[PDB]
Amino acid sequence: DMPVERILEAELAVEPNDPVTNICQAADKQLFTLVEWAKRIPHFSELPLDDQVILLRAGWNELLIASFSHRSIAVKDGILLATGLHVHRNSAHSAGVGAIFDRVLTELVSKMRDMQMDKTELGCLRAIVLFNPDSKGLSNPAEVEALREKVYASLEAYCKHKYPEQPGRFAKLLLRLPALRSIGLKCLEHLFFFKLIGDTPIDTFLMEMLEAP
Amino acid sequence: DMPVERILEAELAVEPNDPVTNICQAADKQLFTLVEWAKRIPHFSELPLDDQVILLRAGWNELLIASFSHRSIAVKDGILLATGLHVHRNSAHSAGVGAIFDRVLTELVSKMRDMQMDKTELGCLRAIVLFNPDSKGLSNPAEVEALREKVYASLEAYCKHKYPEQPGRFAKLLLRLPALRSIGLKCLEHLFFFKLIGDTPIDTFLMEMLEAP
Amino acid sequence: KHKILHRLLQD
Amino acid sequence: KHKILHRLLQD
Ligand SMILES: C[C@H](CCC[C@@H](C)CC(=O)O)CC[C@H]1[C@@H](C)CC=CC1(C)C
Ligand SMILES: C[C@H](CCC[C@@H](C)CC(=O)O)CC[C@H]1[C@@H](C)CC=CC1(C)C
Numbered sequence: 001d002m003p004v005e006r007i008l009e010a011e012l013a014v015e016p017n018d019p020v021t022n023i024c025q026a027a028d029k030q031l032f033t034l035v036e037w038a039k040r041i042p043h044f045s046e047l048p049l050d051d052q053v054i055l056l057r058a059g060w061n062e063l064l065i066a067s068f069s070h071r072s073i074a075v076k077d078g079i080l081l082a083t084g085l086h087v088h089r090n091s092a093h094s095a096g097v098g099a100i101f102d103r104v105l106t107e108l109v110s111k112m113r114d115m116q117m118d119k120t121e122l123g124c125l126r127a128i129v130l131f132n133p134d135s136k137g138l139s140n141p142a143e144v145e146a147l148r149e150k151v152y153a154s155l156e157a158y159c160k161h162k163y164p165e166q167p168g169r170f171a172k173l174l175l176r177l178p179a180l181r182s183i184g185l186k187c188l189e190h191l192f193f194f195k196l197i198g199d200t201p202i203d204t205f206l207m208e209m210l211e212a213p
Numbered sequence: 214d215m216p217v218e219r220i221l222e223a224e225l226a227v228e229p230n231d232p233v234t235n236i237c238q239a240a241d242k243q244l245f246t247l248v249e250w251a252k253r254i255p256h257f258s259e260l261p262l263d264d265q266v267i268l269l270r271a272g273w274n275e276l277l278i279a280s281f282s283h284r285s286i287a288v289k290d291g292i293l294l295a296t297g298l299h300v301h302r303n304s305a306h307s308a309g310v311g312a313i314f315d316r317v318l319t320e321l322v323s324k325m326r327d328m329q330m331d332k333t334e335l336g337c338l339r340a341i342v343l344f345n346p347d348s349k350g351l352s353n354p355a356e357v358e359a360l361r362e363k364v365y366a367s368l369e370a371y372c373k374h375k376y377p378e379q380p381g382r383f384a385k386l387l388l389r390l391p392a393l394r395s396i397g398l399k400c401l402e403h404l405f406f407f408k409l410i411g412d413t414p415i416d417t418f419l420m421e422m423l424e425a426p
Numbered sequence: 427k428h429k430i431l432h433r434l435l436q437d
Numbered sequence: 438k439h440k441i442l443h444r445l446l447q448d
Contacts (some may be wrong), residue, residue: 035434052435053428107347134320134392152384171365174387178394179347185398205430248445265446266439418441 002042002150004158007123010040016082019091020200024191026081028203030064033082037063041127043147048139055144058135060209062184063126069108070122077105100186107179118162121173124155129177136213215255215363217371220336223253229295232304233413237404239294241416243277246295250276254340256360261352268357271348273422275397276339282321283335290318313399320392331375334386337368342390349426 014037038056039045045052072079078088079101092101112122133145152174159170166172188210194200195210202210227250251269252258258265285292291301292314305314325335346358365387372383379385401423407413408423415423 032434035431039435049432049435053431056431056435057428128388148388149381149385152388153381156384168362168366170384171369171387172362174384175341175361175365175390177388178390181391181394182398185395208428208430211428245445248442252446262443262446266442269442269446270439421439421441424439 002147002154004120004124004154006040006042007127007151007154008120010037011119011123011126013037013040016084018200019087019095020097020194022081022083022085022087024194024200024202024206026068026083026085027064028206030067030082031060031205031209034060034063037126038130041130044130047143050137051139051144054135054137055130055132057209057213058132059129061187062129062180065104065108065184065187066122066126066129066180069104070112070117070119072109073113073117075109079104079109097190100183100190103179103183103186107183108176111176111179115169115172117173120158120162121155124151124158125173125177127151128155128174129180215360215367217333217337217367219253219255220340220364220367221333223250224332224336224339226250226253229297231413232300232308233310233407235294235296235298235300237407237413237415237419239281239296239298240277241419243280243295244273244418244422247273247276250339251343254343257343260356263350264352264357267348267350268343268345270422270426271345272342274400275342275393278317278321278397278400279335279339279342279393282317283325283330283332285322286326286330288322292317292322310403313396313403316392316396316399320396321389324389324392328382328385330386333371333375334368337364337371338386338390340364341368341387342393 014033035056038052044055047055068079068081071082075086077090078086080086089098089101089105092098111117128148128151131144131148131151133141133148135141135144138144155173156170159166159173163169191202191206191210195202195207227246248269251265257268260268281292281294284295288299290303291299293299302311302314302318305311324330341361341364344357344361344364346354346361348354348357351357368386369383372379372386376382404415404419404423408415408420
């Protein structure tokens with residue numbers, strides 16, 4: 001009913017001077033791809049359209065950060081954008097965003113790397129993020145909670161079967177979500193500042209995500 | 214090595230006009246009690262003193278929010294402070310902090326209530342929060358990560374044994390942590406504003422927690 | 427309100 | 438730096 005194979009298929013289907021400008025341009029492009037990803041997650045497109053909107057508006061930044069982070073696992077001290085460009089921490093630091101960039105590396109990329117988080121696992125974590133029953137305005141929170149439950153049930157089964165010798169693996173994956181939440185919130189604060197101050201071109205879809213609410 | 218019984222004992226050992234003023238006064242008082250709690254968590258006092266400081270400075274707000282939230286489980290649409298005072302959502306709304314108060318109720322208290330989160334579970338979640346290996350400046354992150362691992366291992370065992378008919382319970386508990394992280398961050402923003410604007414007396418220990426870094 | 431997202435999600 | 442916390446944690 002929530003087959004990890006479909007979740008993996010979703011990940012696979014979507015696979016590809018100022019670093020802030022380059023990252024923001026890439027985020028705008030990846031927001032289109034994000035919508036196509038979400039549609040491939042079982043039961044998401046059967047939700048009411050307004051709830052699909054709520055979930056993507058609530059989760060886009062965590063979903064995109066998870067994706068580039070896992071893509072960056074083999075990169076030394078940097079990230080790999082979907083555009084193929086590598087951004088090193090030195091460049092982020094020299095642009096005034098070293099602190100948040102270092103959190104990304106230390107709390108997400110290195111940890112994904114250290115445990116060899118696989119694409120099924122990444123896919124499931126993202127699906128958990130997508131199905132966030134705390135998102136405000138949801139027509140039926142319980143339905144989304146139920147979908148989240150089916151995803152983590154499937155993830156645990158996957159982990160226990162694929163990595164039986166690591167009984168804490170499942171918990172380890174779920175315990176990267178508070179870091180992801182914190183990092184996503186900080187990235188949003190930054191984006192709102194770039195918008196306010198005018199220091200960075202912000203493309204239309206990214207801009208829409210920054211619109212009220 | 215990380216007995217849930219010791220964790221429960223820690224919880225039990227510590228059990229007790231402007232709602233913002235009343236909440237801040239209570240938070241200041243509970244920060245003293247927090248230190249005494251942390252000392253009762255196995256292996257915490259054996260950490261280097263500087264790391265104990267880092268962990269408590271990084272986690273105090275999430276730890277205090279978890280505590281009042283679980284204390285408030287039987288309260289209708291409000292919270293119960295350690296001072297014994299009940300604060301209703303109507304009062305929070307009329308003080309300009311209704312939004313964050315409602316997140317607390319909807320994302321934490323009601324959810325703790327709905328699943329009947331017990332004190333051992335609360336205690337373990339708080340111990341996970343306390344042992345946050347992502348805290349910056351830690352002399353030995355790996356050691357703290359190891360302690361976090363022992364706590365969640367013990368929690369899962371506890372859950373599987375106490376509630377065998379709820380195989381998703383463990384995941385359900387861990388998946389309240391991203392909400393707790395988000396709510397704690399927002400509460401800090403509020404506190405920094407109250408400090409900036411001068412609208413609320415802030416006592417010495419709370420004030421110290423708001424000091425740099 | 428959120429016109430790009432709605433359009434992409436429709437179909 | 439963080440004088441109250443250090444004092445409470447000591448012993
Ligand atoms: C919130 C976005 C989403 C990024 C997704 C792309 C990397 C898309 C892709 O190429 O996979 C990143 C924001 C950060 C941060 C991480 C780098 C430094 C400052 C920001 C600019 C604030
Ligand atoms: C961060 C603190 C910690 C509270 C602990 C006490 C409730 C202690 C106790 O009595 O258990 C709460 C902060 C919030 C919020 C929740 C209520 C409305 C605005 C704030 C004032 C910003």
